[PDB]
Design a protein around this ligand. Structure first.
Ligand SMILES: [Zn+2]
Ligand SMILES: [Zn+2]
Ligand SMILES: [Zn+2]
Ligand SMILES: [Zn+2]
Lengths: 20, 85
């Protein structure tokens, strides 16, 4: 199993490294 | 503008959601986000109805309109997923 990070955008959910 | 909008709302915290089978998916959310969006995304990725699941934080039920701020959630906190009772 590989790491999975989903961005809940609420707002660009593409980049899961994002912090803003 | 979009970038300045984002930073006013603060940073994403990264939560870990642990399934019944001890698998893990991380979710990034802001402190004022309603957790329904996390519940729905998680349910969608597991192939099951959202209302078939209950989502707990330190054993507490997470409501649709709970926010991480309300819950006192912090970076690297865990959400557990169980079958609805
Ligand atoms: Zn991980
Ligand atoms: Zn934005
Ligand atoms: Zn972290
Ligand atoms: Zn904690």
């Amino acid at each position: 199993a590989e790491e999975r990070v989903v961005v809940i955008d609420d707002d660009d959910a593409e980049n899961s490294s994002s912090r803003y | 503008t979009e970038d300045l909008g984002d930073k006013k709302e603060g940073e994403y915290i990264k939560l870990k959601v642990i399934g019944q089978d001890s698998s893990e998916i991380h979710f990034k959310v802001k402190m004022t986000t309603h957790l329904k969006k996390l519940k729905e995304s998680y349910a969608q990725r597991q192939g099951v109805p959202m209302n078939s699941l209950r989502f707990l934080f330190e054993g507490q039920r997470i409501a649709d309109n709970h926010t991480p701020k309300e819950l006192g959630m912090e970076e690297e906190d865990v959400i557990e997923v169980y079958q609805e009772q």
